[PDB]
Amino acid sequence: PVKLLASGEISRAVTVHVDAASAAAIKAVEAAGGRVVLPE
RNA sequence: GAAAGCGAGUCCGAAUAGGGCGGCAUUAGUACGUCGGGCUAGACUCGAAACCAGGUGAGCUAAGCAUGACCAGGUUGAAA
């Protein structure tokens, strides 16, 4: 698959399309611009 | 972490002690080569008594079977 995890930190707007992501993973993206996108 | 799975966190547990991990002041690898050593192969070299497989042997020897051969001379003296 493809998971998204929260390690890096600088803040900015970017929309990711990972096949999976963690809690604060998402709750870190949009929280600075961008959209986490999981398969339907 | 047994795993689902969760994620810089995660397994114990019903939350608070710990184990493993990140951060730790720091810190990358990977491909090819020479080499040290490991592993699996006969595995530094040489040596076994033995075990297993297929065949060669009764022209020696142990016996069988068919067909032939041989036993001076003397002694004794059974039945009838």
Question: Number of DSSP helices?
Answer: 1
Helix/strand-derived category reads alpha+beta
Task: Trace the largest sheet across and list its strands.
Answer: 1-2
- Helix content estimate: 10-25%
Largest sheet: 2 strands, parallel
Overall radius of gyration: 9 Å
How is this fold's topology laid out?
Layout: E1 3-4, E2 20-21, H1 23-29
Parallel strand pairs: 1-2
This protein binds one RNA strand of 80 nucleotides through helix 1.
PDB class: ribosome
Keywords: ribosome, large ribosomal subunit, 50S, Ribonucleoprotein, Ribosomal protein, RNA-binding, rRNA-binding, tRNA-binding, Methylation, Metal-binding, Zinc-finger
Entry title: Refined native structure of the large ribosomal subunit (50S) from Deinococcus radiodurans
Would you kindly provide a brief summary of this structure?
The protein is 18% helix and 10% strand.
Descriptive overview:
This protein has 40 residues and is α+β, with helices and mostly antiparallel strands. The protein contains one helix and two strands. It has one helix at 23-29; strands at 3-4, 20-21. Strands 1-2 form a two-stranded parallel ribbon. The two termini are 14 Å apart. It binds one RNA strand of 80 nucleotides through residues 3, 5-7, 22-25.
